[PDB]
Amino acid sequence: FGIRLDGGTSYSGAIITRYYDPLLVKVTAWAPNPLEAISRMDRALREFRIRGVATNLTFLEAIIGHPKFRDNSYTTRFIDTTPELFQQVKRQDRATKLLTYLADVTVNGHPEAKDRPKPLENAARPVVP
Amino acid sequence: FGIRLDGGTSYSGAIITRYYDPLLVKVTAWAPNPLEAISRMDRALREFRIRGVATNLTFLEAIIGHPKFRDNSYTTRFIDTTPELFQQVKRQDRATKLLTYLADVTVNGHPEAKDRPKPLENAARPVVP
Amino acid sequence: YFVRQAAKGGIDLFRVFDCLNWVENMRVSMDAIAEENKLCEAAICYTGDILNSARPKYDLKYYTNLAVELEKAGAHIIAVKDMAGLLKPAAAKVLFKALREATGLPIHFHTHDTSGIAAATVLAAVEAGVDAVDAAMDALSGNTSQPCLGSIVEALSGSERDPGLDPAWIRRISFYWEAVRNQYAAFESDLKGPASEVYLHEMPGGQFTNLKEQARSLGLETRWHQVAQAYADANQMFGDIVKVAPSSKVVGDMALMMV
Amino acid sequence: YANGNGVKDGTKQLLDTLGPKKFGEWMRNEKRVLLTDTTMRDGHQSLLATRMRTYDIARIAGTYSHALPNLLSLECWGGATFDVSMRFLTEDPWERLALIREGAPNLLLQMLLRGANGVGYTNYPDNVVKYFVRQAAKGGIDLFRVFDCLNWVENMRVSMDAIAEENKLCEAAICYTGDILNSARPKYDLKYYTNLAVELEKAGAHIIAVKDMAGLLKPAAAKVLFKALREATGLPIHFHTHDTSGIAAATVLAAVEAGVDAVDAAMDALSGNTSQPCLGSIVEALSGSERDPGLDPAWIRRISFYWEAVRNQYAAFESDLKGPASEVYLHEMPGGQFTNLKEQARSLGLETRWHQVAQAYADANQMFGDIVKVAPSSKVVGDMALMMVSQDLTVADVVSPDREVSFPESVVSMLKGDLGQPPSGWPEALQKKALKGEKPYTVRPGSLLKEADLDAERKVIEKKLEREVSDFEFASYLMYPKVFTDFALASDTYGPVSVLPTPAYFYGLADGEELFADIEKGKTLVIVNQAVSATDSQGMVTVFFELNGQPRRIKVPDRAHGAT
Amino acid sequence: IEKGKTLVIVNQAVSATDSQGMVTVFFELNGQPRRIKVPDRAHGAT
Amino acid sequence: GPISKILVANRSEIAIRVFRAANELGIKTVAIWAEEDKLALHRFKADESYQVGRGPHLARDLGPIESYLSIDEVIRVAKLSGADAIHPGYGLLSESPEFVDACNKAGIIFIGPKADTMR
């Protein structure tokens, strides 16, 4: 509810070329009042999953979560001025890390286990009573 | 404009299982008048591209394009009594038969070819002088 | 009935042959092509060696008598069908001179390049007065096919018998066949080139390659020389026969067994 | 297997008795046509990138000797064999020669020699060239077929004088190109050839050869040419051609009819396409005629069947060439290169463009002033062709002063005069544009080079390898310093690998497989591959052999799979 | 990965080691294919 | 007069937006693409498609942006397609008075303001 999209260019598999516009999709968010519209936008933005390429999602999210934006007190110089770098914080990427571990031990073994006796093959997982 | 989507189970990569209801996505179309609403649902549905599973798209199109639908002259009995929404004779029909050859050879190979050398890939097509 | 439909379907020139050069076996077809008012080109299959007196069953007189008898039977054209590519240049000079003195019909020579010198025989036939010859576009020529059309035409370019065919167009057309032929990689044989061995065994353009495949698969791809001598030997046991289409298959069945 | 008796005396004994001059007169005088078998050099050079190994070539020499003792010669050395043998097969070309010489003591052994540089890749001083010829004669060559890639006689003289000085046969070749019967290309008319023949005879030839490296001579032309040649000089004429067009056998038979004294052919299994035409069928066509060469067709077939089984081991090196191509008349690419070339075009995503090339090559040839195209001149014209194709350029486009074109190095080098001089001279403008201020010269390249200090040079190679080198090895080093050096180092690491059979040299041993290997005449090792271990850490694999009954473990890095 | 963030992971296949000595493990993560490359230290590869 | 067929002299989202309105109205549709947008979905999202900026009539191989800003080509694909109208979308041409007088030196209805207001 309250979300309009104007896209068509991006989709998984798509290849973004260096030649044109960087645009992926335009998101339009509607609500009865402006505060509710902001959080509608915020919910949809954060719900986006884009992989394979960098985006401006974090930067879009920072703008709309800004106090000066929420209370409508920004001038045109706001972005060039606020930063308040914003800018940053990284990403955990835990799943990829785990998969790296599993692949490593699957291929190379664990140093504490690799030359020591081995448990009887597919023995029962322990069951919590 | 005037398209709402509420996804259920579908995205590029989704696994659809047989255990639950068969819903992919609900589509809602809005407009100032009812006819223009219909042509917008109609435009949206035909624009969908879903690869991997069959869908009910063409049936939905026959529902909303049908005259009893357009001039609100239908009852709860409409679908159950309208045979030409369910057009059913095994189709074919030259293009369809051709698709069927290509499908079948693509999945199963050709007996004369499938166990023998293969031509060099991305070979020049023959050009008629 | 079949000949009738074939003329209706667009065939104008029927090269008719018999796998044992048996004229009696060609009459019905030859009469049917004349009744459709099309061209009846009666083919004599070439075998053995007219310059070799050790095989006197296939001498000069054998071909000239069959040409006269094909003419009497209604031929509009006589062909020499050299299905194994056995005719040699010196024999072509004698053969086409003698055929053209024995019948007034034109002669049409068809050969296979299995030996790697069919183009020499063709050009010797043209010099001896043969009226027509067969050749394949360069990309589908050579080896067990006909000899190269572009090169034969180029060799005759500017001579008295020049056939007046444009070399630039032959090459463009052969370029196209070349790209066509690439799409058929599945059906290429292992044959690499000229095999003078054809003069011993006489396996015709179709069969040579199949026969080789078939002896690989029956696990003899290592005694091929025994097969070759066998097919030659079988041929003599049968009484020395024209080996083409079905008759060659029978000789190869026999040769494979004896091995 | 042949044969029981000793070997019949052949052309080898005839040359030893008469000497080279009288021996070319004897060729001239002979009624029968004479044959040269090129299977052991030009046949695999053309069809298998010259990868034929000594093992397969030497095991057959004794059968040629007993079964075809009437052959004129076996062309079996020079052309690309010299460096390819060391660079790619890790084997020594001298050993190849000495083994052929041992197995066929009755036939002439023949090589192809470039006059300017012998078997090398660049220009060398006269003394080096002389030294090479002297070693080639010492090591078993009887017949040197000497050519120049521009048919410049000047550039052949040093080779021709060195051959005569050694008392060997000097067969001076004239490269055929164009078409003597087409009056629209008058630069290569009949007179062009008969005058070269007369220059070559004054320069000391014992035999004249026509080398039709691209297979361009057509039969009606052979008839005119060989008649006229044998009227312009008393020397025997020797005809070598290639079958790219699919009609070279017709050209050979026309030449034989016209009086030609000797011809080249390859055994059936290595003939046709860009190789020589079929030996057994040419022999079969002549059988019973006036000029009948007297070679037994049942032996040719048996030796061909042996070469066919040998060729099957070399599947890695087969090209995609499917048969006759009359477009050879348009582009004139030499058989010996229409395949090294076919896959420079591959390595540059040109494979599907391979036709426009053809036309760039004829075009390039003509802008160069229309020249003889044969190893290394063809190479130059190919490099030009590919470039007009890639950089998508034309000839006005190539010679226009305005359009920058950075030229391939081989083209820069030729226009400079490193391959010599066409009759001709190089086109002024193209030369100035291509040279970029580098200065061209017009004398014999050989004649600018300082004499090599042969002593100093010998000590350099000897100090590097830390042992004496033989005279033969020294010749090798003079021709290819770097390729010889790597070969010598590899031999010291790997042993006499030339003695392994082909499937073993390229693929090693299957599990459990047994091989006999002659480290030397009369020293046979029996070697069994017992097993091969999983690779270990540190990434080593151990192969368990039995050597003459005794277990031996050898450890090798597992490079395949990333291990050092 | 955390209370209430459950990954489903399937080991689909493991490649032969390549040169440069890398092995790629083909996973499915929550339905989606993922390839991960690891050195084959076991067997001497860096 | 009665608009049957619209050519969208643009790309990406703007082109798709116009395609959508066209569709729902029963107006047929024409897309243009340069060679670099060979793969772009807007060229499939129309009922007809033509390349702009390459070929026999040129006289240079055109640029990827250039290809879309080119009056000649745009007109060309309009005239060849049988298009009664052009939507320029935004950016690119949409404020080029040269391009307008051209729609209608070619008698092709231009979706937007007359050329005078534009100058």
Ligand SMILES: O=CCCCC[C@@H]1SC[C@@H]2NC(=O)N[C@@H]21
């Ligand atoms: O086109 C009609 C779609 C609506 C009918 C299908 C619904 S989806 C949920 C419910 N559970 C089912 O088994 N089918 C219905």
Ligand SMILES: [Cl-]
């Ligand atoms: Cl070197």
Ligand SMILES: [Cl-]
């Ligand atoms: Cl641009």
Ligand SMILES: [Mg+2]
């Ligand atoms: Mg003589």
Ligand SMILES: [Zn+2]
């Ligand atoms: Zn035939």
Ligand SMILES: [Zn+2]
């Ligand atoms: Zn040669």
